[PDB]
Nucleic acid binder design. Structure first.
Ligand code: BEF
Ligand code: BEF
Ligand code: MG
Ligand code: MG
Lengths: 202, 205
DNA sequence: GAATTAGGAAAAATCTTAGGCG
DNA sequence: CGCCTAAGATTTTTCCTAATTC
């Protein structure tokens, strides 16, 4: 069955590496490309799409990026099937990203044809099992974050301030402090330096 | 003249694009593709290559990533013309990189005709610097760029993991003294937030 | 000319504490 | 019950500004 696809990633050096990997398949039809949540959400109705290979960490002029952007597409577009393509190798973060309920998940640092082999696994009722059965079997199950803490820490390490994440997501510094201060105790780190060490070490 | 090119990035999907991209050019030939530092150094002598396309964010045991690495590549393999192709944007990083003298720097978050124009530029012994690159370069543009003793002394402890207050305590001075020196330093390097700073302090380690 | 040192005003962040949910 | 959410009081940390002496 002919399944049409849209792609979303901040890097066009990445996008131009996916579009070439999927045209191998004769039934696949890559209809649209985007680099931000704003232009993406705008041109979603105007283009018919069954499935989507969208990024985790992106620029969101208004409509936001990440688990925020995922569940706003899930709600306003249950029409679509979402595949999360991130460079985030971190378990603590990717933890709640699994629980989100997406079509399939693919890693950038995973072999190139991990994406076509999650376009088959979806077509017949992918690497969300291999991830979870590696993640749960890893020995970092005590460091399992919530869909908010994973969204908070992500943006902290991306190089935003606390108060800029509040402005990002519609909360107060008091709200976000708690979600980071909470997320830190889950990981068992006292300072930021030691936190970002556990957000690279993965 | 037809040149012999290498590619280096941990993300093989990025490697695929960069590999597929160089096929469009009739004189361009790719001799190698690598996923870390350790490997790039192994088959650096092995291949007859004039040019390299490398990430600053590449994993490796024996050799570092970014500045630490490019410093090794500039010295131990000097003949080679270099183009740095990274996601990264922390101006303090790119500052010290463009200081190691490379043909150019392609921001992986730039335009897709960056790398063609970057090889077209080096094909005529020049350096391409997109508006995306120019933008972040101005930050430090405004001795001067060089850090002070007590500033560098502080930054060391901040990176160690000692919070600002713990530094003041440890050295007999007020918080205001250290923040002045901490943020003074930051202002020199051309980094706003604590993240993009620590990212620099590791890139030069 | 800048380095090291701050002080008082100001901003950012953490700290209880506390209300309603699956 | 952990979860998001937050406003008090508090802390940390910057911001603005100006004193040292080389
Ligand atoms: F931008 Be994503 F994190 F690969
Ligand atoms: F994604 Be790479 F660092 F260009
Ligand atoms: Mg990205
Ligand atoms: Mg990388």
């Amino acid at each position: 069955n002919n399944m049409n696809v849209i792609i979303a990633d901040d890097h066009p050096i990445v996008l131009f590496g996916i579009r070439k990997s999927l045209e191998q398949i004769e039934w696949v039809n890559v209809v649209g490309e985007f680099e931000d949540s704003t232009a993406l959400i705008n041109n979603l109705p105007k283009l018919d799409a069954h499935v989507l290979i969208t990024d985790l960490s992106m620029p969101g002029d208004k409509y936001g990026d990440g688990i925020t952007l995922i569940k706003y597409i899930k709600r306003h577009f249950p029409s679509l099937s979402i595949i999360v393509l991130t460079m985030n190798n971190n378990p603590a973060i990717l933890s709640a990203v699994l629980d989100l309920d997406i079509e399939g998940i693919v890693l950038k640092q995973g072999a190139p044809t991990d994406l076509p082999k999650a376009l088959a696994a979806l077509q017949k009722g992918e690497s969300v099992s291999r991830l979870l059965e590696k993640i749960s079997a890893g020995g970092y199950g005590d460091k399992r974050l919530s869909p908010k803490e994973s969204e908070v820490l992500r943006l902290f390490a991306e190089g935003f301030l606390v108060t800029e994440i509040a402005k990002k997501l519609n909360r107060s510094i008091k709200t976000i402090s708690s979600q980071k201060k909470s997320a830190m105790m889950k990981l068992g780190v006292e300072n930021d330096i030691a936190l970002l060490n556990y957000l690279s070490s993965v």
